[PDB]
Amino acid sequence: MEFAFYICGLIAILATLRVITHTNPVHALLYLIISLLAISGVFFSLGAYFAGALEIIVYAGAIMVLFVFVVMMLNLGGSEIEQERQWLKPQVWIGPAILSAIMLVVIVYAILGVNDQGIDGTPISAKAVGITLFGPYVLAVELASMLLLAGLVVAFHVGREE
Amino acid sequence: DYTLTREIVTDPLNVFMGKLNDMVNWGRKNSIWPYNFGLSCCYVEMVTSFTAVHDVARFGAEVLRASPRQADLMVVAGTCFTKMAPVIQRLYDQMLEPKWVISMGACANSGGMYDIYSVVQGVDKFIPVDVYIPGCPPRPEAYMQALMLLQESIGKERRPLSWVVGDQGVYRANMQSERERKRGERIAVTNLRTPDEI
Amino acid sequence: WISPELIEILLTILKAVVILLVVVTCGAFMSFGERRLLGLFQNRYGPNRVGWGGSLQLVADMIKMFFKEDWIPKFSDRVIFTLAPMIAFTSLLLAFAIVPVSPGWVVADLNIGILFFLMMAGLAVYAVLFAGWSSNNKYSLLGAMRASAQTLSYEVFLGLSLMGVVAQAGSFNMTDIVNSQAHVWNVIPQFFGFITFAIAGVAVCHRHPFDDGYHIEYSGMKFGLFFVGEYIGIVTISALMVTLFFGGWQGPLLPPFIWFALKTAFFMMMFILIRASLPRPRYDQVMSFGWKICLPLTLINLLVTAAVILWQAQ
Amino acid sequence: MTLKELLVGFGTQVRSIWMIGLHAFAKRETRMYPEEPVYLPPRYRGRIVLTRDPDGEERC
Amino acid sequence: MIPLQHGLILAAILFVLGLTGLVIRRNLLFMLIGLEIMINASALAFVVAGSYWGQTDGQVMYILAISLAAAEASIGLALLLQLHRRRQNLNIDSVSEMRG
Amino acid sequence: STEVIAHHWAFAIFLIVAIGLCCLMLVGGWFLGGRALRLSAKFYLVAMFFVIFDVEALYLFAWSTSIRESGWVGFVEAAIFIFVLLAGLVYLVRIGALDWTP
Ligand SMILES: CCCCCCCCCCCCCCCCCC(=O)OC[C@H](COP(=O)(O)OCCN)OC(=O)CCCCCCCCCCCCCCCCC
Ligand SMILES: CCCCCCCCCCCCCCCCCC(=O)OC[C@H](COP(=O)(O)OCCN)OC(=O)CCCCCCCCCCCCCCCCC
Ligand SMILES: CCCCCCCCCCCCCCCCCC(=O)OC[C@H](COP(=O)(O)OCCN)OC(=O)CCCCCCCCCCCCCCCCC
Ligand SMILES: CCCCCCCCCCCCCCCCCC(=O)OC[C@H](COP(=O)(O)OCCN)OC(=O)CCCCCCCCCCCCCCCCC
Ligand SMILES: CCCCCCCCCCCCCCCCCC(=O)OC[C@H](COP(=O)(O)OCCN)OC(=O)CCCCCCCCCCCCCCCCC
Ligand SMILES: CCCCCCCCCCC1=C(C)C(=O)C(OC)=C(OC)C1=O
Ligand SMILES: CCCCCCCCCCCCCCCCCCCC
Ligand SMILES: CCCCCCCCCCCCCCCCCCCC
Ligand code: SF4
């Protein structure tokens, strides 16, 4: 259980690091899908079975499909992206990487000073999640429907062709 | 007696290598996927052979790919018009090894009755042919007979099993001609049915 | 090394391996059986010469596709081009990995179940997308976008068609789903769920009549991987339909695996008959049917199923 | 589309499936070349020969 | 027997990686990709926190997070397609006409 | 329990042998045998509709497995959710968003 957690976390970290430094958009999206599968494995190792199932079903099965679809529609041949490699220049990324490293050290220092009895990994099913969802979290469900409706209306208004 | 391509040579055929070659030839001759290519009326007779009354599927030769990459057999079933000849050559070049060619009908054999300004006189002017079918059109069972002739020719050819080990030359069997094979039983014919009946 | 725990572990692993091998063999023999059954439906014989009754034909195409020259397009993305048939095979194979073929004969008794099936189908759309993109052919790319838009239009209600059966069982587990069918099979209460699941399962498997092509560049063994994965998906969809709507392995007299195999073979034959019988609708008609008819039908079926369940819980 | 159109179309699809299944229950129309020899009518235009007169000399 | 700090550290690492990808990339598509990495890392942090406390609240917050991620991906890709239609490039530095 | 760890081992072997079988099939196919347009926005719109309705589908997935525990109150809430879903679908169909042909 822990062994799967560490391997899946390492795979997610390495795949995301491959994502943010890659030039090909389809390869970057493939590495992102791999990282999402690894994060789903992390979810399954922690007992969040519904979260891992939705991580593959929706995040790696709908949202990344939309990203891949849009990349095909653009026909991205790396025009002025691969031919420049501006993010690979050390003078470009040395600043933001140092900033992200400083923020990571601050967050990790805050994390390490918290009480931790360990995660038991007892499986929390989708039945309990649905009980909470339509019990104490009813208005979250209905206003999330309104949020998805707003996203639908906005994306239809903007993404037409005429 | 064999013909080499990389020369009139002899049989190169360990006993396990011969068995592997026989297994590969059996699998290749029993799974022949033709390319769906329509040139003229001979194609109508070919797809007639594909239908229920003849059922060329019984020989495992019905899959009829629309892509040259997935096809193992090219049937030139029709006239090789001069505007269609580069198309035929390009589709043949897009095919992958091993590939075989059947000329179907007098047009594909030699130009047929169309010794005319706009017709290439036979497809073997520019692409190599394995089996020729005379006829205008050959009937569907003539196409099936040519398919069996191609199966016999495939069943004792020699090709490399792998591209990393061994001889990479292709050895094709120098068959006895069907004319000389059938001459004994054809000349002995004396009487035929009179053409006034059904 | 003699211990009952290790013996049970090895027995369960051996049962899973047997299930995997039988499913892959049944997919290849399903390609051969599609040729034979199309012959039966069309007043002919099909392949009946290579071996006894044509039974050795599949070995002949396997040998032919193995010893065909392996070819990749020159300006193609090699990794993605190789990766598409991997997905097309493995996705619905791993979807089969939850199917209970008999009491005590299952690979994984997961608590997610048909959620794992939905995971596998949502991953399986990438095979079509990757085959279209990586081939470096604009006809193949356009065909892949059309096919993937169709599969999204039917994947949008595949799970909602299963949700009536899930609601009746009260669980995502497949053993609980087939145990809730101990008295009446789910095809009777979830009939509209059954037909919507049938339409969605045929559409996401790229079967007739939902079949400028994204496979024209593939050849040799990758094309065979595409075909064998398609037939494995046919077997997986048929087995899932049997387990979710026709009691799984439950039956009066025959052994449970005999009942499961008979029902799966019947739905396999119905796949073949659907290909032989129906004409192909237009693309816009197919997608309008997916969005306007089937998805509201699944939603209304779920609502009525919940109303019946809560009314019957006194 | 109309509900009646959908129902009529569904019944039409069921009818097509039923007729193809009954076609499966029918007699095969295949002539099994080459095991079954092809019947040819006596004036069929196939291979050309040269014949002999009844005295045995060639007619040409 | 997995520490809560280890899961939070993994989520923080993924979050800062996504933010770095959002900053260093001139392409709008890679910016949207980094945004998706960031929101998925935050949702993973919520899942880790919910699994430590043995509550469904982490998975419920995950559900809300991915609903937001889906709708934001939809809107962002619509705006990216509009940008590609009206400018034929995805350079985000060129979209800078309002300043001062 | 021995049964669950046996099933975990069997599932792991299933995934490993399936992936390895497909990999070995590709390797054998490579080793054997000798050698020798602008996409419309409707594609994006359809994929976007799939994403949005798939998220609403996940909400209904969570509801469906716990229908008896939620009671009639959960039925009323899910009926409101499904009515909002269907109103959005009716709106999409009526404005020509879901019409492939113009
Ligand atoms: C081996 C070295 C590395 C080799 C290269 C990488 C290969 C893939 C490695 C990651 C996936 C497999 C990890 C190993 C899992 C083995 C099984 C295991 O550990 O099960 C434990 C646990 C079972 O559940 P639980 O009830 O908690 O068990 C306690 C016992 N009662 O299990 C769980 O709770 C969850 C089990 C894991 C989650 C499911 C599978 C996730 C798959 C993620 C793939 C990500 C993409 C990989 C791409 C690789 C190529 C770049
Ligand atoms: C124009 C605007 C739109 C209008 C609407 C259009 C869409 C309409 C969609 C309708 C959907 C109807 C779905 C009905 C399902 C009802 C059955 C059901 O869900 O029963 C559940 C119950 C099992 O549940 P339970 O008893 O709880 O078992 C676990 C034990 N604790 O099951 C049982 O106990 C067995 C009950 C068997 C019931 C069989 C009869 C009903 C289902 C079959 C209908 C067939 C219709 C045929 C075609 C009609 C014309 C279209
Ligand atoms: C293991 C699981 C699978 C096992 C196999 C068994 C299930 C197979 C399911 C096959 C589903 C095929 C669905 C095809 C839907 C086609 C819809 C469509 O686009 O129809 C278009 C057509 C005309 O549309 P319209 O807009 O009116 O245009 C008129 C313009 N002049 O509109 C019409 O003609 C209206 C009617 C359309 C079709 C209605 C649905 C028919 C479904 C197929 C028949 C299934 C019968 C049962 C089979 C056995 C099931 C066990
Ligand atoms: C998502 C899908 C939504 C739609 C389906 C929903 C579920 C089914 C709900 C009920 C459907 C009833 C359909 C209408 C039946 C009666 C009318 C009818 O058959 O219409 C079709 C057609 C009409 O005839 P017409 O085309 O005008 O030709 C001139 C002939 N006078 O007449 C004909 O073609 C001739 C008669 C054909 C009868 C076909 C069978 C009708 C009953 C089917 C019951 C269920 C079958 C399940 C699968 C069986 C096969 C495995
Ligand atoms: C080409 C290859 C690409 C990569 C393929 C996958 C990489 C990893 C391969 C090795 C996997 C090793 C074994 C992993 C663990 C298996 C057992 C397991 O998942 O156990 C955890 C849990 C058990 O549930 P259960 O025990 O019933 O719960 C009650 C409490 N005990 O069960 C669960 O939580 C079940 C849910 C997790 C199942 C994950 C299955 C694989 C998912 C990724 C599929 C990728 C498909 C190919 C690529 C698609 C395109 C990217
Ligand atoms: C090797 C596995 C084959 C599975 C089935 C392949 C597709 C159906 C048979 C081939 C075929 C195709 C494609 C076809 O399009 C066709 O119509 C012209 C035929 O009839 C002559 C066919 O026989
Ligand atoms: C064309 C416009 C390009 C804009 C690029 C902006 C890059 C900003 C990089 C910031 C780097 C900060 C480095 C760390 C500073 C010290 C730590 C934070 C403050 C305490
Ligand atoms: C098309 C069906 C595919 C099934 C794949 C899995 C096959 C597993 C076979 C298991 C056989 C034994 C089942 C338990 C014993 C009960 C039945 C005994 C008579 C067969
Ligand atoms: S040989 Fe005769 S039948 Fe064949 S293509 Fe030529 S004209 Fe047509």
Swiss-Prot record, chain E:
Its main location: membrane. It is a multi-pass membrane protein. It is an enzyme of class 7 (translocase). Gene3D superfamilies: 1.10.287.3510. Its EC number is 7.1.1.-. GO terms for molecular function: NADH:ubiquinone reductase (non-electrogenic) activity; quinone binding. It is found in: Cell inner membrane. Keywords: Cell inner membrane, Cell membrane, Membrane, NAD, Quinone, Translocase, Transmembrane, Transmembrane helix, Transport, Ubiquinone. The keyword Cytoplasm does not apply. The chain crosses the membrane at residues 4-24, 28-48, 60-80. GO terms for biological process: ATP synthesis coupled electron transport. It catalyses: a quinone + NADH + 5 H(+)(in) = a quinol + NAD(+) + 4 H(+)(out). One of its GO terms (cellular component) is NADH dehydrogenase complex. NDH-1 shuttles electrons from NADH, via FMN and iron-sulfur (Fe-S) centers, to quinones in the respiratory chain. The immediate electron acceptor for the enzyme in this species is believed to be ubiquinone. Couples the redox reaction to proton translocation (for every two electrons transferred, four hydrogen ions are translocated across the cytoplasmic membrane), and thus conserves the redox energy in a proton gradient. NDH-1 is composed of 13 different subunits. Subunits NuoA, H, J, K, L, M, N constitute the membrane sector of the complex. PANTHER family: NADH-UBIQUINONE OXIDOREDUCTASE CHAIN 4L, NADH-UBIQUINONE OXIDOREDUCTASE SUBUNIT ND4L. Belongs to the complex I subunit 4L family. This is NADH-quinone oxidoreductase subunit K. It comes from Escherichia coli (strain B / BL21-DE3). The lineage of its organism: Bacteria, Pseudomonadati, Pseudomonadota, Gammaproteobacteria, Enterobacterales. The gene is nuoK.
